[PDB]
């Protein structure tokens, strides 16, 4: 469900519709 809290892409993708997921903080 939640992505990894160690991916720099999780921050960049956070501002994209193709990545509206929720990375586990």
Curated annotation (Swiss-Prot):
What about PTM?
Homologous desensitization of the receptor is mediated by its phosphorylation by beta-adrenergic receptor kinase.
Q: Which cysteines are joined by disulfide bonds?
A: 13-19
Task: Specify the domain of life of the species encoding this protein.
Answer: Eukaryota
The places in or outside the cell where this protein is found are:
Cell membrane; Early endosome
Side Extracellular, residues: 1-19
The annotated subunit structure for this chain is: Interacts (via C-terminus PDZ motif) with RAPGEF2; the interaction is direct. Interacts with GOPC, MAGI3 and DLG4.
Similarity comment: family membership: Belongs to the G-protein coupled receptor 1 family. Adrenergic receptor subfamily. ADRB1 sub-subfamily.
Q: What is known of its domains?
A: The PDZ domain-binding motif mediates competitive interactions with GOPC, MAGI3 and DLG4 and plays a role in subcellular location of the receptor.
Role played: Beta-adrenergic receptors mediate the catecholamine-induced activation of adenylate cyclase through the action of G proteins. This receptor binds epinephrine and norepinephrine with approximately equal affinity. Mediates Ras activation through G(s)-alpha- and cAMP-mediated signaling. Involved in the regulation of sleep/wake behaviors.
Q: What is this protein called?
A: Beta-1 adrenergic receptor
Organism (species):
Homo sapiens
Q: What is the lineage of its organism?
A: Eukaryota, Metazoa, Chordata, Craniata, Vertebrata
Q: Which residues of the full protein are shown?
A: 197 to 215 of 477
